[PDB]
């Protein structure tokens, strides 16, 4: 024959993260582009590697 | 390519110089270095004049 008890409660936990910028670059001189060499064109191989 | 090459060839006589004096009746002659390689069996050589 007593009274009702006191109430209690809790809260969730917050989590977060960030976004990151990525960059990769390739470069070739115009003379080397026109120059014909074995192992194919240098620009395409550089693009593949990068 | 930025670097290019070509080949040229000259047509010349087969001229030999006798370094050592030889009298009539000598079957062996001495010439300048590596000059005798051009001649083979059957070639006709004639003494030249001014």
**Nearest-neighbour CA in chain B from A48: distance (Å):** 24
Provide the 3-class DSSP secondary structure of residue B29. coil
Quote the CA–CA distance of B30 and B28 in Å, as a whole number: 7
Shortest CA distance from B2: residue in chain A = A35
Query: Which contiguous run of DSSP H or E holds residue A47?
Result: helix A42-49
Quote the CA–CA distance of A34 and B1 in Å, as a whole number: 8
Quote the CA–CA distance of B16 and B30 in Å, as a whole number: 10
Quote the CA–CA distance of B18 and B26 in Å, as a whole number: 13
Could you tell me which residues come within 8 angstroms of residue B31 by beta carbon, excluding any fewer than 6 positions away?
B16, B17, B18, B19
Provide the 3-class DSSP secondary structure of residue B18. strand
Q: Contact A46/A28 with Cβ under 8 angstroms?
A: yes
Header resolution in angstroms: 2.8
Cβ distance A36 to B2 less than 8 Å, yes or no, reads no
Contacts of A36 in chain B (CB under 8 A): 1
Other CB atoms within a 10 A radius of the CB of residue A42 amount to 15
Method: cryo-EM
With an 8 Å Cβ cutoff, the interface of chain B facing chain A consists of 1-2
Provide the 3-class DSSP secondary structure of residue B31. strand
- Restricting to A residues 12-31, those with a Cβ less than 8 Å away from any Cβ of B are 31
């Amino acid at each position: 024959g007593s009274l009702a008890p006191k109430s209690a409660t809790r809260n969730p936990v917050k989590l977060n993260n960030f976004c990151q910028i990525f960059k990769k670059s390739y470069e070739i001189t115009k003379t080397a582009d026109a120059t014909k060499a074995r192992t194919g064109s240098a620009l395409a191989n550089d693009k593949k590697r990068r | 390519d930025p670097e290019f090459s070509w080949w040229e060839e000259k047509l010349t006589h087969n001229r030999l110089e006798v370094k050592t004096e030889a009298a009539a009746g000598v079957t062996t002659l001495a010439v300048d270095t590596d000059q005798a390689w051009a001649c083979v069996k059957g070639d006709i050589l004639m003494v030249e004049s001014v």
